[PDB]
Amino acid sequence: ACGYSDRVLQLTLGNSTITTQEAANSVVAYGRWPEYLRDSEANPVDQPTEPDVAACRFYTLDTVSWTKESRGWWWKLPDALRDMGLFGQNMYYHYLGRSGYTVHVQCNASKFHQGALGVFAVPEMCLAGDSNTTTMHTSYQNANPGEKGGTFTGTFTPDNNQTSPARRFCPVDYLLGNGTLLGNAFVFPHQIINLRTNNCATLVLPYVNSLSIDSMVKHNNWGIAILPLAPLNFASESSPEIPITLTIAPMCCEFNGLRNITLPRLQ
Amino acid sequence: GLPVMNTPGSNQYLTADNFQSPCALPEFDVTPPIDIPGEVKNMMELAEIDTMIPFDLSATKKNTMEMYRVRLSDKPHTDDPILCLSLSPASDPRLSHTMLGEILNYYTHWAGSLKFTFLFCGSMMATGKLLVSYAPPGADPPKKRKEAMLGTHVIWDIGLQSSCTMVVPWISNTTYRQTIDDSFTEGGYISVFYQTRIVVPLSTPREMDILGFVSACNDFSVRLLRDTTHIEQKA
Amino acid sequence: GLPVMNTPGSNQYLTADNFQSPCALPEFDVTPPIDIPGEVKNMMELAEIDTMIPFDLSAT
Amino acid sequence: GLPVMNTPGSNQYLTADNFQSPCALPEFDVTPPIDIPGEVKNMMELAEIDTMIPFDLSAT
Amino acid sequence: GAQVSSQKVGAHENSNRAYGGSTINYTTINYYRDSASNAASKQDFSQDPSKFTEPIKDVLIKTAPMLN
Amino acid sequence: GAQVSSQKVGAHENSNRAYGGSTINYTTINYYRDSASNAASKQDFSQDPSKFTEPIKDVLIKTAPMLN
Amino acid sequence: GAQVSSQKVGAHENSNRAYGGSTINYTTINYYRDSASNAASKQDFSQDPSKFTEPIKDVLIKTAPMLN
Amino acid sequence: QVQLQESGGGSVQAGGSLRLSCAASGYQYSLLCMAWFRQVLGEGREGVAFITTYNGAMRYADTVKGRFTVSQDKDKNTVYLQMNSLKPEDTAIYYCAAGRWRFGDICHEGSGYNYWGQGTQVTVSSH
Amino acid sequence: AATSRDALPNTEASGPTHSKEIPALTAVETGATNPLVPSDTVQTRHVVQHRSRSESSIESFFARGACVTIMTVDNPASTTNKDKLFAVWKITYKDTVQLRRKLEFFTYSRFDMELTFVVTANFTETNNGHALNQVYQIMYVPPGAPVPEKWDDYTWQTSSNPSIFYTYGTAPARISVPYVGISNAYSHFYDGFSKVPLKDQSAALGDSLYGAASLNDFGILAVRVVNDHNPTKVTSKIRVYLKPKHIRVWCPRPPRAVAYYGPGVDYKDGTLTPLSTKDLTTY
Amino acid sequence: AATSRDALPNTEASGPTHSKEIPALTAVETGATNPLVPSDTVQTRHVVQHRSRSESSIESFFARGACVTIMTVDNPASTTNKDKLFAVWKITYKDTVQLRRKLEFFTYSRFDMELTFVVTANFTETNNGHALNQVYQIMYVPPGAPVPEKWDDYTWQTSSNPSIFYTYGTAPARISVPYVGISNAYSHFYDGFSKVPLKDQSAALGDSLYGAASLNDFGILAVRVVNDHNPTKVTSKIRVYLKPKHIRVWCPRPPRAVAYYGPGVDYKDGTLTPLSTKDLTTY
Ligand SMILES: CCCCCCCCCCCCCCCC(=O)O
Ligand SMILES: CCCCCCCCCCCCCCCC(=O)O
């Protein structure tokens, strides 16, 4: 009738709108659309702040470079969005805070490029360390890379300085970073950006945790990992490169217990 | 009082029993459960989720990214197989590590239709038709297009719809097959052959790859729980 | 609780008993039985079938 | 008599159990309880009574 | 949810206002959840050996010549 | 205050005026005061894998082209 | 002469046509003649801490100045 | 783990006849696929003959076939190797491997063999 | 309706006869067993019959438990050079005559089994050494799980292997197992092969064992002495009793006449002589 | 309504086809698992299906008890210089592979546990010395209570520590514990830190351990041999069996593929290789 495509989508939250023509529709993780904390499962007693539009808006994290040597990339939430305007602010000014997310991973090539990127949304994405001598030792700074994120690697390299250990992650790609076979990763909500079909991915994730509401600064809820299923090749070109950009967005977010500002030692 | 008699089995601890016992924390207030999104009811559901099969487990390619990429090409048409695979959803190294496979290592008899879905990943400009085949067991495993051809197969066609699904119907003698390497209850063979050839225009990557996915259909079910061979704690 | 008393025979394994016991494979799905032709109900039926008696059992 | 079977836990003394047992003083006449003023029902009530916090716990 | 059935009485005591006469019954209660665990009722049926003894297509009438 | 339920019968003895046929039931009686102490009924429900398999916003109709 | 009561259910199995839903009950039967021998029901009442917290003769109305 | 206690080499000359005994320690019953081998001095470590525990069926190597016969001591868990017509080239460190089995599939070389024997060497002296 | 515990047909009274009806005659050639009753040939009086087949019904024929194996375990001292022997027996009724012959009367069957374990122990060395009551573990490793390697490796962590912990000096242990066949009936006999030898392949890989099928593969039992090393060696044996219950059968075969030899139907030389000498003319 | 013990959907009969409907085609890109049934691609006959998922329901997947630890106790002579060893084990499933992997399939869960204790003993010195039947105590010290110091201090007066007194040579001991989480579900995985390192503070006091949360802290078990000193030393071991019951789970994760190393998700070098060699062209 009016040619509505499952490729043409338009996401709008707050003051931003992301359209798109080559979409592969969208996934509503687990089949639950995000929502505000109910009274049945309410917990903390004080009135909850509901920043709405001041927070419910698409923020764009920094873009990455996709090449043949790209092994993968990973970002934590709400972590990554810790410097994002008000949502960044409202995050530090509270003890508790639940939030949903809408991740729209953009990345386009041309009919002459090829490859596949799998965008995965792992709930509670605990990544592995770098030292083979000390378990779960990784430091806070390393654990929360913020908007820049960290990356997967082709080989496990042990942390050998036991005098001043690197205390960071060393996630091995085929093992989805946390010692599990990638080929199974397909169990978490996800979408595959296959250059021939689409140019974006759209996952809507509803807050998933063990509590009704929790500390943001402390416990990361979600985990967005992007790995190249099929490597990137172009033309007869030795050095092809196309950029990938993640634009995340908090939804139905609410925070409780206003206090004084928390200043985390990020370095 | 009431005259009773202890029969065989009194005092035998069966790890698999189901008897009531006393409470070590009387009147404990269990914290009410919330509605966490995504509750699983049965292992079979997980099994119905698509998982990428690691088809190429060659010496150098095993345990490294290269394992999930089946490489096709623009070479001229031949009647040789692109990929082979024994339908032993638990015993064949290729199926053994997929979700459907991993759940199978906790049972003794699996049953039902299994499905293989392939995703083409080359340029938009490249095109073709690949033959995906399923030959029930009990004859020479097909080696030439001709023979695969005779059995249950679907001729895909690459296009705007990026993925092709082939169902492998449940055709077997028994009513469940041994989850181990067994001849009597063997499964069959899955195979992929170029029906035409993959053609590419000029200035396009000459070698693109495919990804494979397996999973259970609604009629799949397993039974008799056992421990798994996919993990061991030395000492 | 309920005061009971163990009478003679407690803990005696009678190969010919008929008591219930626990299940070693909870919730196992028993495969439904088909209609195989020729079901016997009692040993006596087999006994009602003619069989050739070996009358001459001489040395050779 | 009644065929029974002893399951796991027979003869385990759980300090926190709740089973009935025999009486060591049959037919004892329990002296009726009077109305003593101030009966507590739950520990939480005591907790709802104000108590002076010792804020300064310095050396001296 | 009991199973009160009858017992075929053999040697009859000299009683009937309890034992002997008034049909003796027994009670059974399945204790487990799995069928595989119940005790065999022994209250089984019987059939006619015809499926073995008289497997002849054209019904056999004993009185008559068997080959007509 | 018993719990008389049914058992799904597998191998059927040759009986039906006790076993085999007439739906076999079992009785259960909770002995303790704490829920935590009861034996698992195993009489659990099932759902549709859709919350996992078909997590697509716009309902999927298999017959049609998946990307329209 | 049993005592069929209810149990406050905590973790609910995936059942309701046995467990989970339909209010779980337990049966108790006192076995001895002496009260002193029964097991504590734990089905005790509660009161208002007022006999301790608000022991003031002239009823306290929180909203108002406490000393008028 | 299964143990394969082998016995017992020697360098007798051409045309000779010796024998090797190898135990199941181990649980010989349906599992083990008792096989024979000999390491041709660094060349060199071939499979001689292999017996099936469950039935007692033997298969041999195209080399040994005929001269060498594999024997089985079911009850006392031993598998023998009557090494006949020992010729100079029957010089190599002998082996006894035993794997598991396929319920009904015959014990062959392409099949086994999980566990390892002692490797008792039998040499055939030359003239 | 005709149950096992029903009275046999009352024999009727019948008198003299001179007719064209020929009861007495048959022609076993048809294959039909001539169905005569006492009254057919000789004169009979009326008789109210009371005997009932109730104790010979398929159920009752198998109603006795039977020894199937003898599994050997032991717990030797830690100082010993020999390794603590744990037994592993493959589950197959065919290990002992008794139950097998009773089972052979039928081509197929469906039966929920009930296993009982009688465990007896004893000392070996003539030392007035002691031993504390031992505790045994009987772990059912279904087809394909990792078979125990050492008396003390992980495998015994029974994450999913239904197990039993039997203390010595208590009533024998017992577990129920439902029909676990991969078929619709257990096959006491399997005519054929698992693998078809193919024309384009090696005979080796094409060869299997006659009459060997998965139909009757059911995993193994693993038995070990849970108590650690004890100064005085104590051996023990675990006898396993199987009693088929809720049984049903299909197609009668003639009973095994000559001594069994191995898991197959096969027979050995010398044993092929069942009947004895008797004279054709001597009653 | 659809219970675990319900028959799977009966497969319909379907014949030849030549239409515009494309079942066979998908685009996993959407993320949706293409939902086809046998009848979709190939012609099928009608089949009344009898198999039911009843034995794979979440409940049944965890329905086997599992070893979680091996606690060591002993009662040495009073004359000995070494002190009577009493074991104290922190309650965490993570001490053994088996149950952990089965639990890892899920991000979160709520389960009322049932613990069973098999206690086996033995002598050590090669003395024909005796020992009277021993009595064990298993005391549950919840988080924060005073952990036992000596095998004989007050702490054992169990004023409030729910305890168990197990006589040796009797049926294993068993206690039920309801869901005791401080949350709404037990967290098998905790991404984050307990302490946030603050900008105005010392790194030391700001540092915690990644993936270490109170969510999974549950106190310790204290085990001791109640009988006093005995002339002949007797060691004993207490195996603890945990069987989750009344279980429910949330969010599937892929199963652990490489050997576990420590309480974290972490892995060690060398072990990072799960799959074996196989050829792309050989079936
Ligand atoms: C822990 C012990 C559990 C025991 C389970 C035993 C495995 C099943 C054995 C079934 C034996 C049935 C024999 C018939 C075999 C046939 O003739 O086909
Ligand atoms: C006397 C023994 C009483 C035993 C009580 C044990 C304490 C509770 C242990 C709960 C274990 C639950 C494991 C899940 C933990 C998690 O993953 O968060």
Q: Where are the alpha helices (DSSP H) in chain I?
A: 38-41, 58-62, 97-104, 203-206
Which CATH architecture best describes the domain A1-267? Sandwich (2.60)
Q: Distance between CA atoms of H95 and H119, rounded to whole angstroms? A: 5
Q: How far apart are the first and last CA of chain B?
A: 51
Q: Within the 44-83 window of chain B, which residues sit less than 8 Å (CB to CB) from chain A?
A: 46, 49-54, 63-65, 67-69
- The CA–CA distances, whole Å, from B75 to A230, B196, B203, I187, J9 equal 20, 11, 16, 52, 45
Question: C28: nearest CA in chain E?
Answer: E34
Asked whether the beta carbons of G24 and F54 are under 8 A apart, the reply is: no
Radius of gyration for chain J, computed over Cα atoms and rounded to the nearest angstrom:
27
* Residue I167 structure tokens: 């203390």
* Residue A224 structure tokens: 């967005």
- Side-chain-side CA neighbours of B175 within 13 Å: the count stands at 18
Q: Where are the alpha helices (DSSP H) in G1-68?
A: 50-53
- Contact across the interface for J54 and F8, Cβ inside 8 Å: yes
Residues of B whose CB is below 8 A from I197: none
Number of Cβ atoms within 10 Å of the Cβ of E26: 9
Please choose, from the candidates J213, J117, I265, E12, the residue with its C-alpha nearest in 3D space to the C-alpha of residue D8: J117
Asked whether the beta carbons of A145 and A96 are under 8 A apart, the reply is: no
Sign of CA dihedral B156, B162, B167, B168: positive
Residue B114, burial from CB neighbour count under 10 angstroms (0-12, 13-18, 19+): buried
Type of residue numbered A22: E
Q: Where are the alpha helices (DSSP H) in A93-244?
A: 140-143
Asked whether the beta carbons of B3 and C7 are under 8 A apart, the reply is: yes
Q: Experimental method used, please?
A: cryo-EM
For strands B114-120 and B163-168, give the pairing: antiparallel
Asked whether the beta carbons of E60 and I19 are under 8 A apart, the reply is: no
CATH number at residue G28: 4.10.80.10
Q: How far is D27 from chain J (nearest CA, A)?
A: 30
- The shortest CB-CB distance from F10 to any of E1, E35, E44 is to E35
Per domain, the residue ranges of chain I are 1-283
Say whether J93 sits in a helix, a strand or coil: helix
Q: Per residue, what are the HEC states of J132-180?
A: CCCEEEEEEECCCCCCCCCCCCHHHHCCCCCEEEEECCCCCEEEEECCC
Q: Within the 15-54 window of chain D, which residues sit less than 8 Å (CB to CB) from chain C?
A: 19-20
- The CA–CA distances, whole Å, from H38 to A88, B117, F43 equal 73, 48, 60
Neighbours of chain I (3+ CB pairs under 8 A): B, C, E, F, H, J
Residues of A whose CB is below 8 A from B96: none
Asked whether the beta carbons of C39 and E48 are under 8 A apart, the reply is: no
Topology adopted by domain J1-283: Jelly Rolls (2.60.120)
- 3-state class percentages of chain H: helix first, strand second, coil last, to nearest 5: 0, 50, 50
Ligand nearest I141 Cα, by number? 1
Establish whether the linkage from the previous residue to H113 is cis, with ω within 30° of 0. yes
- Side-chain-side CA neighbours of A267 within 13 Å: the count stands at 0
Please choose, from the candidates I111, E51, I58, I183, the residue with its C-alpha nearest in 3D space to the C-alpha of residue C38: E51
* Residue B12 structure tokens: 């035998």
Q: Distance between CA atoms of I160 and I141, rounded to whole angstroms? A: 9
Q: Distance between CA atoms of A190 and A226, rounded to whole angstroms? A: 10
In eight-state DSSP terms, residue I263 is S
Residues with CB under 6 A from ligand 2: B 24; J 91, 93, 113, 115, 138, 140, 162, 175, 177, 180, 186-188, 215-216, 218, 221
Residues of F whose CB is below 8 A from E30: 7, 24-27
DSSP string, F18-52: SSSSS--EEEE---SS-GGGSPP---BB---THHH
Q: Distance between CA atoms of B120 and B161, rounded to whole angstroms? A: 10
Indicate which residue's Cα is closest to atom 14 of ligand 1: I186
Q: Which of F12, F22, F25, F26 to mutate to test the interface with E (most CBs of E within 10 A)?
A: F26
- Domain count within chain B: 1
Asked whether the beta carbons of J192 and J47 are under 8 A apart, the reply is: no
Strands of the H121-125 sheet, one edge to the other: H10-13, H121-125, H92-97, H35-39, H46-51, H58-60
Q: Distance between CA atoms of F47 and B33, rounded to whole angstroms? A: 19
* Residue A111 structure tokens: 């009919």
Number of Cβ atoms within 10 Å of the Cβ of J128: 12
Q: Per residue, what are the HEC states of chain B?
A: CEEEEECCCCCCEECCCCCCCCECCCCCCCCCCCCCCCEECEHHHHHCCCEECCCCCCCCCCCCHHHHCEECCCCCCCCCCCEEEECCCCCCCCCCCCHHHHHHCCCCEEECCEEEEEEECCCCCCECCEEEEEECCCCCCCCCHHHHHHCEEEECCCCCCCEEEEEECCCCCCCCEECCCCCCCCCCEEEEEECCCCECCCCCCCCCEEEEEEEECCCCEEECCCCCCCCCCCC
CA geometry: angle J135, J138, J139, nearest 5 deg: 135
Ligand nearest J163 Cα, by number? 2
Q: How far is J54 from chain C (nearest CA, A)?
A: 6
Q: Distance between CA atoms of A222 and B140, rounded to whole angstroms? A: 49
Indicate which residue's Cα is closest to atom 2 of ligand 1: I140
Phi-psi group of B70: left, alpha or beta (phi > 0 → left; psi -120 to 50 → alpha; rest → beta): beta
Q: Which residues contact residue I257 at a Cβ distance below 8 angstroms, ignoring those fewer than 6 apart?
A: I274
* Residue C49 structure tokens: 């079938």
Tracing tokens 């046998």 back to the chain, one arrives at J38
DSSP string, I122-164: EE-SS-----PPPEEEEEEE-TTSPPP-STTSGGGG-SSS-EE
Strands of the H6-7 sheet, one edge to the other: H6-7, H16-23, H78-86, H68-73
* Residue B76 structure tokens: 């001229």
Indicate which residue's Cα is closest to atom 8 of ligand 1: I218
Residues of A whose CB is below 8 A from J252: 187-188
Q: Distance between CA atoms of I273 and C57, rounded to whole angstroms? A: 12
Asked whether the beta carbons of A107 and A245 are under 8 A apart, the reply is: yes
C24 in contact with ligand 1, CB cutoff 6 A: yes
Number of Cβ atoms within 10 Å of the Cβ of A141: 16
Asked whether the beta carbons of A142 and A253 are under 8 A apart, the reply is: no
Q: Where are the alpha helices (DSSP H) in chain J?
A: 38-41, 58-62, 97-104, 203-206
Q: Which residues contact residue B19 at a Cβ distance below 8 angstroms, ignoring those fewer than 6 apart?
A: C22, D7, D8, F39
Q: Where are the alpha helices (DSSP H) in A73-229?
A: 85-92, 140-143
Asked whether the beta carbons of I178 and E35 are under 8 A apart, the reply is: yes
The reply to whether B183 touches chain A by the CB within 8 Å rule is no
- The CA–CA distances, whole Å, from I37 to E59, I9, I21 equal 18, 10, 14
Q: Where are the beta strands (DSSP E) in chain A?
A: 9-13, 16-20, 27-28, 59-60, 64-66, 73-76, 94-106, 113-123, 150-151, 190-194, 200-205, 222-234, 242-258
CB burial of I190-222 (b: ≥16 within 10 Å; e: otherwise) equals beebbbeeeeeeeeeeebbbebbbbbbbbbbbb
I156 in contact with ligand 1, CB cutoff 6 A: no
Residues of E whose CB is below 8 A from F27: 1-2, 29-31
Q: Which residues contact residue I79 at a Cβ distance below 8 angstroms, ignoring those fewer than 6 apart?
A: none
Q: Where are the beta strands (DSSP E) in chain J?
A: 25-26, 66-75, 87-90, 106-123, 135-141, 163-167, 173-177, 186-187, 220-225, 234-252
Number of Cβ atoms within 10 Å of the Cβ of A186: 23
Please choose, from the candidates B215, B40, A31, the residue with its C-alpha nearest in 3D space to the C-alpha of residue F47: B40
| Shortest-distance atom of ligand 1 to CA I215 | 18
- The shortest CB-CB distance from E46 to any of I4, I22, I40 is to I4
Residue B85, burial from CB neighbour count under 10 angstroms (0-12, 13-18, 19+): buried
Q: Which helix (H) or strand (E) holds F53?
A: helix F50-53
Asked whether the beta carbons of J176 and F37 are under 8 A apart, the reply is: yes
Q: Distance between CA atoms of C31 and F10, rounded to whole angstroms? A: 7
What is the domain range of residue G61? 1-68
Entry resolution in angstroms?
4.2
Establish whether the linkage from the previous residue to H104 is cis, with ω within 30° of 0. no
Give the Å distance between the CA of I245 and the centre of ligand 1. Answer: 12
Question: B106: nearest CA in chain I?
Answer: I160
- Domain count within chain F: 1
In eight-state DSSP terms, residue A141 is H
Asked whether the beta carbons of I166 and I71 are under 8 A apart, the reply is: no
Residue B76, burial from CB neighbour count under 10 angstroms (0-12, 13-18, 19+): exposed
Mutate to test the pocket of ligand 1, among I92, I103, I161, I216 (most ligand atoms within 8 A of CB): I216
In eight-state DSSP terms, residue I44 is B
Mutate to test the pocket of ligand 2, among J218, J238, J241, J246 (most ligand atoms within 8 A of CB): J218
Q: Distance between CA atoms of C38 and C47, rounded to whole angstroms? A: 15
Q: Distance between CA atoms of F27 and G27, rounded to whole angstroms? A: 13
Give the Å distance between the CA of G20 and the centre of ligand 2. Answer: 22
| Beta bridge mates, H97 | H35
Indicate which residue's Cα is closest to atom 17 of ligand 1: I188
CATH number at residue B5: 2.60.120.20
How many residues can be counted in chain E?
Answer: 68
Chain J meets chain E (3+ C-beta pairs below 8 A): no
